[PDB]
Coordinates of all heavy atoms in Angstrom, one line a residue:
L58 N 80.2 -16.5 -39.9 CA 80.4 -15.2 -40.5 C 81.4 -15.4 -41.6 O 82.5 -16.0 -41.3 CB 80.7 -14.1 -39.5 CG 79.5 -13.6 -38.6 CD1 79.4 -12.1 -38.5 CD2 78.2 -14.2 -39.0
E59 N 81.0 -15.0 -42.8 CA 81.9 -15.2 -44.0 C 82.5 -13.9 -44.5 O 83.7 -14.2 -45.0 CB 81.2 -16.0 -45.1 CG 80.6 -17.3 -44.7 CD 79.2 -17.5 -45.4 OE1 78.3 -16.9 -45.1 OE2 79.3 -18.5 -46.2
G60 N 81.9 -12.8 -44.5 CA 82.6 -11.6 -45.1 C 81.6 -10.8 -45.8 O 81.5 -9.5 -45.7
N61 N 80.8 -11.4 -46.7 CA 79.8 -10.8 -47.6 C 78.4 -10.5 -47.0 O 77.6 -10.1 -47.9 CB 79.8 -11.8 -48.8 CG 81.2 -11.7 -49.4 OD1 81.7 -10.7 -49.7 ND2 81.8 -12.9 -49.7
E62 N 78.2 -10.6 -45.8 CA 76.9 -10.3 -45.1 C 76.6 -8.8 -44.9 O 77.5 -8.0 -44.8 CB 76.7 -10.9 -43.7 CG 76.6 -12.4 -43.6 CD 77.9 -13.1 -43.6 OE1 79.0 -12.6 -43.9 OE2 77.8 -14.3 -43.2
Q63 N 75.3 -8.6 -44.7 CA 74.7 -7.3 -44.4 C 73.4 -7.6 -43.7 O 72.6 -8.3 -44.2 CB 74.5 -6.5 -45.7 CG 75.7 -5.8 -46.1 CD 75.7 -5.1 -47.5 OE1 75.1 -4.1 -47.7 NE2 76.5 -5.7 -48.4
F64 N 73.3 -7.1 -42.5 CA 72.2 -7.3 -41.6 C 71.5 -5.9 -41.3 O 72.3 -5.1 -40.8 CB 72.7 -7.8 -40.2 CG 73.4 -9.1 -40.2 CD1 73.8 -9.8 -41.4 CD2 73.6 -9.7 -39.0 CE1 74.5 -11.0 -41.3 CE2 74.3 -10.9 -38.9 CZ 74.7 -11.6 -40.1
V65 N 70.3 -5.9 -41.6 CA 69.5 -4.7 -41.5 C 68.1 -5.0 -40.9 O 67.5 -6.1 -41.2 CB 69.3 -4.1 -42.9 CG1 68.8 -2.6 -42.9 CG2 70.4 -4.3 -43.9
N66 N 67.6 -4.1 -40.1 CA 66.4 -4.3 -39.4 C 65.3 -4.0 -40.4 O 65.5 -3.5 -41.5 CB 66.3 -3.3 -38.2 CG 67.3 -3.9 -37.3 OD1 68.4 -3.4 -37.0 ND2 67.0 -5.1 -36.8
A67 N 64.0 -4.2 -40.0 CA 62.8 -4.0 -40.8 C 62.2 -2.7 -40.2 O 61.6 -2.6 -39.1 CB 62.0 -5.2 -40.6
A68 N 62.3 -1.7 -41.1 CA 61.7 -0.3 -40.8 C 60.2 -0.5 -40.6 O 59.7 -0.4 -39.5 CB 62.2 0.6 -41.8
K69 N 59.5 -0.8 -41.7 CA 58.1 -1.1 -41.8 C 57.9 -2.5 -42.3 O 58.7 -2.8 -43.2 CB 57.3 -0.1 -42.6 CG 57.5 1.4 -42.3 CD 57.2 2.3 -43.4 CE 55.8 2.2 -43.9 NZ 55.2 3.4 -44.6
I70 N 56.9 -3.3 -41.9 CA 56.6 -4.6 -42.4 C 55.1 -4.6 -42.7 O 54.2 -4.6 -41.9 CB 56.9 -5.6 -41.2 CG1 58.2 -5.4 -40.6 CG2 56.7 -7.1 -41.8 CD1 58.2 -6.2 -39.2
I71 N 54.9 -4.8 -44.0 CA 53.5 -4.8 -44.6 C 53.0 -6.1 -45.1 O 53.4 -6.5 -46.2 CB 53.4 -3.7 -45.7 CG1 53.6 -2.3 -45.0 CG2 52.1 -3.8 -46.5 CD1 54.3 -1.3 -46.0
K72 N 52.0 -6.6 -44.4 CA 51.3 -7.8 -44.8 C 50.2 -7.3 -45.8 O 49.8 -6.1 -45.5 CB 50.5 -8.6 -43.7 CG 50.9 -8.2 -42.3 CD 50.2 -9.3 -41.4 CE 50.4 -9.2 -39.9 NZ 49.3 -10.0 -39.4
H73 N 49.9 -8.1 -46.7 CA 48.9 -7.6 -47.7 C 47.6 -7.5 -46.9 O 47.4 -8.4 -46.0 CB 48.8 -8.5 -48.9 CG 47.8 -8.2 -50.0 ND1 46.4 -8.1 -49.8 CD2 48.0 -7.8 -51.3 CE1 45.9 -7.7 -50.9 NE2 46.8 -7.5 -51.8
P74 N 46.8 -6.5 -47.2 CA 45.6 -6.2 -46.5 C 44.6 -7.4 -46.6 O 43.9 -7.6 -45.7 CB 45.1 -4.9 -47.0 CG 45.6 -5.0 -48.4 CD 47.1 -5.5 -48.2
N75 N 44.7 -8.1 -47.8 CA 43.8 -9.2 -47.9 C 44.3 -10.5 -47.3 O 43.5 -11.5 -47.4 CB 43.2 -9.2 -49.3 CG 42.4 -7.9 -49.5 OD1 42.3 -7.4 -50.6 ND2 41.8 -7.4 -48.4
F76 N 45.4 -10.5 -46.7 CA 46.0 -11.7 -46.1 C 44.9 -12.4 -45.3 O 44.2 -11.8 -44.5 CB 47.2 -11.5 -45.3 CG 47.8 -12.7 -44.7 CD1 48.3 -13.8 -45.4 CD2 47.9 -12.8 -43.3 CE1 48.8 -14.9 -44.8 CE2 48.4 -13.9 -42.7 CZ 48.9 -15.0 -43.4
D77 N 44.9 -13.7 -45.5 CA 43.9 -14.6 -44.8 C 44.7 -15.7 -44.0 O 45.0 -16.8 -44.7 CB 43.0 -15.2 -45.9 CG 41.8 -16.0 -45.4 OD1 41.6 -16.4 -44.3 OD2 41.0 -16.1 -46.4
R78 N 45.1 -15.5 -42.8 CA 45.8 -16.5 -42.0 C 45.2 -17.9 -42.1 O 45.8 -18.9 -41.9 CB 46.1 -16.1 -40.6 CG 46.4 -17.2 -39.5 CD 46.3 -16.9 -38.1 NE 46.2 -17.9 -37.0 CZ 46.7 -19.0 -36.7 NH1 47.8 -19.5 -37.3 NH2 46.4 -19.7 -35.6
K79 N 43.9 -17.8 -42.5 CA 43.1 -19.1 -42.6 C 43.4 -19.8 -43.9 O 43.7 -21.0 -43.7 CB 41.6 -19.0 -42.4 CG 41.3 -20.2 -41.4 CD 40.1 -21.0 -41.7 CE 40.2 -22.2 -42.6 NZ 38.9 -22.4 -43.4
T80 N 43.2 -19.2 -45.0 CA 43.4 -20.0 -46.3 C 44.7 -19.6 -46.9 O 45.0 -20.1 -48.0 CB 42.2 -19.7 -47.2 OG1 42.2 -18.4 -47.7 CG2 40.9 -20.0 -46.3
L81 N 45.5 -18.9 -46.3 CA 46.9 -18.4 -46.8 C 46.7 -17.7 -48.1 O 47.7 -17.4 -48.7 CB 47.9 -19.6 -46.7 CG 48.6 -19.8 -45.5 CD1 50.0 -19.4 -45.5 CD2 48.0 -19.1 -44.3
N82 N 45.5 -17.5 -48.5 CA 45.1 -16.8 -49.7 C 45.7 -15.4 -49.6 O 45.6 -14.9 -48.5 CB 43.6 -16.7 -49.7 CG 43.2 -15.8 -50.9 OD1 43.9 -15.9 -52.0 ND2 42.2 -15.0 -50.7
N83 N 46.4 -15.0 -50.7 CA 47.0 -13.6 -50.6 C 48.1 -13.6 -49.5 O 48.1 -12.8 -48.6 CB 45.9 -12.6 -50.1 CG 45.3 -11.9 -51.3 OD1 44.8 -10.8 -51.0 ND2 45.3 -12.5 -52.5
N84 N 49.0 -14.6 -49.8 CA 50.2 -14.7 -48.8 C 51.4 -13.9 -49.4 O 52.2 -14.6 -50.0 CB 50.4 -16.1 -48.6 CG 51.3 -16.2 -47.3 OD1 51.6 -15.1 -46.8 ND2 51.5 -17.4 -47.0
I85 N 51.4 -12.6 -49.2 CA 52.5 -11.8 -49.8 C 52.7 -10.6 -48.8 O 51.7 -10.1 -48.4 CB 52.3 -11.5 -51.3 CG1 53.5 -10.6 -51.7 CG2 50.9 -10.8 -51.5 CD1 53.4 -10.0 -53.1
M86 N 53.9 -10.2 -48.5 CA 54.2 -9.1 -47.5 C 55.4 -8.3 -48.0 O 56.3 -9.0 -48.6 CB 54.5 -9.9 -46.2 CG 55.0 -9.0 -45.2 SD 55.5 -9.9 -43.7 CE 57.0 -10.7 -44.3
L87 N 55.4 -7.0 -47.7 CA 56.6 -6.2 -48.1 C 57.3 -5.8 -46.8 O 56.6 -5.7 -45.8 CB 56.1 -5.1 -48.9 CG 55.8 -5.5 -50.4 CD1 55.1 -4.5 -51.3 CD2 57.2 -5.8 -51.0
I88 N 58.6 -5.6 -46.8 CA 59.4 -5.2 -45.7 C 60.3 -4.0 -46.1 O 61.2 -4.2 -47.0 CB 60.2 -6.2 -44.9 CG1 59.7 -7.7 -44.9 CG2 60.5 -5.7 -43.5 CD1 60.7 -8.8 -44.4
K89 N 60.1 -2.8 -45.6 CA 61.0 -1.7 -46.0 C 62.1 -1.7 -44.9 O 61.7 -1.6 -43.7 CB 60.2 -0.4 -46.0 CG 60.9 0.9 -46.5 CD 60.1 2.1 -46.1 CE 60.7 3.4 -46.0 NZ 61.0 4.0 -47.4
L90 N 63.3 -1.9 -45.4 CA 64.5 -1.9 -44.5 C 64.8 -0.5 -43.9 O 64.4 0.5 -44.7 CB 65.7 -2.4 -45.2 CG 66.1 -3.8 -45.6 CD1 65.8 -4.8 -44.4 CD2 65.2 -4.3 -46.8
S91 N 65.3 -0.4 -42.7 CA 65.6 0.9 -42.1 C 66.6 1.7 -42.8 O 67.0 2.7 -42.2 CB 66.0 0.7 -40.7 OG 67.3 0.2 -40.9
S92 N 67.2 1.3 -43.9 CA 68.2 2.0 -44.6 C 68.7 1.1 -45.7 O 68.8 -0.1 -45.4 CB 69.4 2.3 -43.7 OG 69.8 1.0 -43.1
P93 N 69.0 1.7 -46.8 CA 69.4 0.9 -48.0 C 70.6 0.0 -47.9 O 71.6 0.3 -47.2 CB 69.5 2.0 -49.1 CG 68.6 3.1 -48.6 CD 68.8 3.1 -47.1

Side-chain angles (χ1 to χ4, degrees):
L58 293 224
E59 306 140 293
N61 298 308
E62 290 82 348
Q63 277 173 74
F64 300 9
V65 198
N66 289 114
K69 303 160 56 156
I70 315 161
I71 294 147
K72 342 193 182 162
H73 181 294
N75 298 146
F76 181 63
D77 189 347
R78 155 195 161 51
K79 228 219 93 210
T80 74
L81 275 254
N82 173 37
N83 264 205
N84 196 1
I85 177 187
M86 170 185 71
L87 276 174
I88 328 170
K89 185 195 158 76
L90 281 316
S91 73
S92 55

